[PDB]
Design a binder for this molecule. Structure first.
Ligand SMILES: O=C1N(c2cncc3ccccc23)CC[C@@]1(O)c1cccc(Cl)c1
Ligand SMILES: O=C1N(c2cncc3ccccc23)CC[C@@]1(O)c1cccc(Cl)c1
Ligand SMILES: [Cl-]
Ligand SMILES: [Cl-]
Ligand SMILES: [Cl-]
Lengths: 299, 305
C-alpha cells in the first residue's frame, strides 16, 4: 500500500555527472564514453558559432570528482556543446538519447558544480515547460527514465522562465517548447492538465482503496472532451483510452466510467475530501508509472 | 525557483542492496563492509509470525542456511547474530562499494529518502517523514522488507530506517539500523494499529517560510500570537504542539524573510480557520508537513524573492 511521487534510482546517472567551466561560467556536464555533453551557453544576442571559434580545447575545464579531464576536441549540436575528452567514462551505463512527448514523466538529478544534490520526479507539461526545482548553477542537470538496465536520457536543463518554471532540451540539443537560449523576453504559454495522467492516478486511488468518487454513470468520448475543454484539460484520445485498458480490467471500471467520475469532480470539486492525500487532481503519474508502482518493477 | 519533494541521490545506497533468503522467505539486506543487515523475520514462516520465538528459531540455523545474493554473485555467510529486531550476517567479502556511513536514530518530524527494493534490486526512490505516531506513509509492497531510509548531507550516508511491516491502515513500521522499532510496534502478526496521527507543525511553518522565499505572501496577516495561544488553537486541528525548540530552529528562516516565528504562527492559525479559498501555496491545496526547517534551507535560495 501507499502511493508516492517516485523517481528512478539515480546511481547510473550520478556516475556520469561532471563540472564544466569556461571562463567565469560553471555548470554541469554529462560524461558518456569519451564525450561530455553540456548547454552551449557555458561559452557566453549570442552568435554561438562566433563565440565557439574563439575557444580552444584548453579553455574548457572539466572536473570529474577530484580529477581533471583533458578536452581534446569540441563541437556544437543544436543547443548542446559536445566536448571530446581523452578518457572514456568507466562508469558509462547502457544508454539511449530519447525525445519525450508532453505528458511523459521522468526523473531529474539536480546537480551543482558537477555534484548531485537531489532527485525528483516530474512531467513534461503540455506547454513544454517543467515545474522543477532549480537554482542558478543547476544548468546541465539531466532528466531520464530507466528501461530494464538502459538509461534513456530525455532532458538537459538550460533556463528558468519568469513564472519560476523551467525550460530545456533533449540530449541532441533541441528545445522542448518555443524557447531560445538567450536573455530575451520569453514566457510559458497557458498550460493544461494532462487528462490521461489524472485518470491513471484515479485508477491508482481505486487500487489503494479510495473509491468515494466512483459513480454508476458512464460517458462518451466526445461528451467527455466537450467538458474537459471547458476546464483546461488536454483532449482524451482513443490512444489514451487504449493505454488505460489494463487498469480498467484490474479495477473493473471502464475508462469512460472513470471519465464520468472525473467530470463530476471537475463540476463539483472534492467537497472537503482528498484522493491519495491530495485536494487537487494529480497529473504527473502516467498509466505506466501507476502499473510500475503497483507491481514493484526493479532496475 | 520551484519547490519539490526532493530525495537524496540513491547511488551510494544502491551499491549496498542485496537479496537475503532463508528457506522460503526472500527479502532485502544492506551490505556494509563485511556485514549484511536485514529484518530478523526472514527466519520466520507465515505461521511463526503470531508468536515467534526468534531466539529459538535462530539457534536452529547455521551459516549455510542464509543465502545472500549481490547482483549475480553469491556471498558466503561466515557468522550470524541478532541485535534487537535486526539480523546481522557476517560475510567473507567486504562490499567494495561501501560508502562513508553512520547509523542514526531519528525523531518524529524528521524526513528521509527511501530506496524501495524487491529481491535485492532497487525499484524507486521517494521522500518520507517519520510521522508523530512513529509510522511512515510509504509505498511498499510485499517483498520490500529490508528496504532502507537515509539522508546524505555531505558525502556521508546516515541510515535511519529499515522497513519491517505494513499496518492495517496501509502505513508502515520499521526499525533504526540497530534493530530498535520506532513506536510501540513489534515484529509479530498480533493486532497492532497506528495511533491517531497529527500534523508536524514545525514542518508546516518551515514550508510557509519556503513559500515566502519563493515569492508568495497572500496568507500573511497583521496579527501575532503568544506560543501558548497558538498551541491551544493548533491542538484543536490535530497539530503537534510547537515547542520553544521549534521556535529556536525556525530562527534562521525568520531572519531571512523578516517574519517573526510567532507572526508566521498567526498566519498558520488563520489558514486553519479559513482554508485556502481556491488558492494554493507552492502548488498545494493542503498544508504540507513533510519538509523540515533544514530541508527548506537546503533546497531554497538564500535570497528571498
Ligand atoms: O535561466 C537561467 N539560469 C537559471 C536556470 N535554472 C534556474 C535558475 C534560477 C535562478 C536564476 C537563474 C536560473 C542560469 C542561466 C540563465 O540565467 C539563462 C539566461 C538566458 C538564457 C539561458 Cl539558456 C539561461
Ligand atoms: O507487514 C508485512 N509485510 C509487508 C511489508 N510492507 C508492505 C506490505 C504490503 C502488503 C502486505 C505485506 C507487506 C511483509 C511481512 C509482513 O506480513 C509482516 C507481518 C507481521 C509482522 C511483520 Cl514484522 C511483518
Ligand atoms: Cl478539483
Ligand atoms: Cl556500524
Ligand atoms: Cl532527528
Amino acid at each position: 500500500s501507499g502511493f508516492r511521487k517516485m523517481a528512478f534510482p539515480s546511481g547510473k546517472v550520478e556516475g556520469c555527472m561532471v563540472q564544466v567551466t569556461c571562463g567565469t561560467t560553471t555548470l554541469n556536464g554529462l560524461w558518456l564514453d569519451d564525450v561530455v555533453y553540456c548547454p552551449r551557453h557555458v561559452i557566453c544576442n549570442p552568435n554561438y558559432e562566433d563565440l565557439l571559434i574563439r575557444k580552444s580545447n584548453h579553455n574548457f575545464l572539466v572536473q570529474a570528482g577530484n580529477v581533471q579531464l583533458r578536452v581534446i576536441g569540441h563541437s556544437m549540436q543544436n543547443c548542446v556543446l559536445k566536448l571530446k575528452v581523452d578518457t572514456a567514462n568507466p562508469k558509462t551505463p547502457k544508454y539511449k538519447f530519447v525525445r519525450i512527448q508532453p505528458g511523459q514523466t521522468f526523473s531529474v538529478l539536480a546537480c551543482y558544480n558537477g555534484s548531485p544534490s537531489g532527485v525528483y520526479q516530474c512531467a513534461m507539461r503540455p506547454n513544454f515547460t517543467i515545474k522543477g526545482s532549480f537554482l542558478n548553477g543547476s544548468c546541465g542537470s539531466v532528466g531520464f527514465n530507466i528501461d530494464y538496465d538502459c538509461v534513456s536520457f530525455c532532458y538537459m536543463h538550460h533556463m528558468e522562465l519568469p513564472t519560476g518554471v523551467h525550460a530545456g532540451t533533449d540530449l541532441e540539443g533541441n528545445f522542448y517548447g518555443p524557447f531560445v537560449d538567450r536573455q530575451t523576453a520569453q514566457a510559458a504559454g497557458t498550460d493544461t492538465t494532462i487528462t490521461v495522467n489524472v485518470l491513471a492516478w484515479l485508477y491508482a486511488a481505486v487500487i489503494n482503496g479510495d473509491r468515494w468518487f466512483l459513480n454508476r454513470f458512464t460517458t462518451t468520448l466526445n461528451d467527455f472532451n466537450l467538458v474537459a475543454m471547458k476546464y483546461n484539460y488536454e483532449p482524451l484520445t482513443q490512444d489514451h483510452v487504449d493505454i488505460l485498458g489494463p487498469l480498467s480490467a484490474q479495477t473493473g471500471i471502464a475508462v469512460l466510467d472513470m471519465c464520468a467520475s472525473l467530470k463530476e469532480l471537475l463540476q463539483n470539486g472534492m467537497n472537503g475530501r482528498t484522493i491519495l492525500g491530495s485536494a487537487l487532481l494529480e497529473d504527473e503519474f502516467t498509466p505506466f508509472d501507476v502499473v510500475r508502482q503497483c507491481s514493484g518493477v526493479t532496475f
